[PDB]
Design a protein around this ligand. Structure first.
Ligand SMILES: OC[C@H]1O[C@H](O)[C@@H](O)[C@@H](O)[C@@H]1O
Ligand SMILES: OC[C@H]1O[C@H](O)[C@@H](O)[C@@H](O)[C@@H]1O
Ligand SMILES: [Ca+2]
Ligand SMILES: [Ca+2]
Ligand SMILES: [Ca+2]
Ligand SMILES: [Ca+2]
Ligand SMILES: [Cl-]
Lengths: 111, 112
């Protein structure tokens, strides 16, 4: 897997479209090593290819596969307010669930 | 090493540049036959390369203004047809053709 980060921020729909344009997908760390690699390529908070849109509190990748490895920041996921169904990687490498309509950098994943 | 990825949609060069740079890469510029073949492997149809003779006609440089050495022009090219062809695409046989920068083609991005 190869990881590339975007320079501008955008909502998840646009993030997905960007990675897909070059035939990749939004980055999904499957272990601590990939998590670190993604963190390093990201210069700020960035979207991961994980969501609990289909079923609340059931996080899966963009292809429907339930994720096994997680690295939730203390207190997360909390689905605050009207809801948070997307996921971002913070600058310390931990994850936080956020509204999919909010804008962050995106890290794309390629094989 | 360099990694190459092809786009799914077609677009003019300026847009191709914007796409590749959005992920901090550049439009693919093969520096030898091996890289040219690697770009061929990912491009399913005619695609833009990061080469132009926009500065001086018939003097081809990569997008950073660096004059290229290796070229793989299709027979009869570059011919700068009509009002001008200052951009370059990789044909499906691996050979190159100069085309209008305003015409749309797939784009192959390059990363390292
Ligand atoms: O207090 C943490 C809390 O801060 C904000 O409300 C958002 O970033 C939430 O996603 C996060 O859980
Ligand atoms: O005949 C070859 C000629 O065909 C078209 O006119 C264009 O694709 C040109 O760029 C190319 O040189
Ligand atoms: Ca949720
Ligand atoms: Ca949260
Ligand atoms: Ca020309
Ligand atoms: Ca031509
Ligand atoms: Cl949401």
């Amino acid at each position: 897997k190869y990881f590339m980060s975007s320079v501008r921020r955008m909502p998840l729909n646009r993030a997905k479209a960007l990675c897909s344009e070059l035939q990749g997908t939004v980055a999904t760390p499957r272990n601590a090593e990939e998590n670190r690699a993604i963190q390093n390529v990201a210069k700020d908070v960035a979207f991961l290819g994980i969501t609990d849109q289909r079923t609340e509190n059931v996080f899966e990748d963009l292809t429907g596969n339930r994720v096994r490895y997680t690295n939730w920041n203390e207190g997360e996921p909390n689905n605050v307010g009207s809801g948070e169904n997307c996921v971002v990687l913070l600058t310390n490498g931990k994850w936080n669930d956020v509204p999919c309509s909010d804008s962050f950098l995106v890290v794309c994943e390629f094989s």
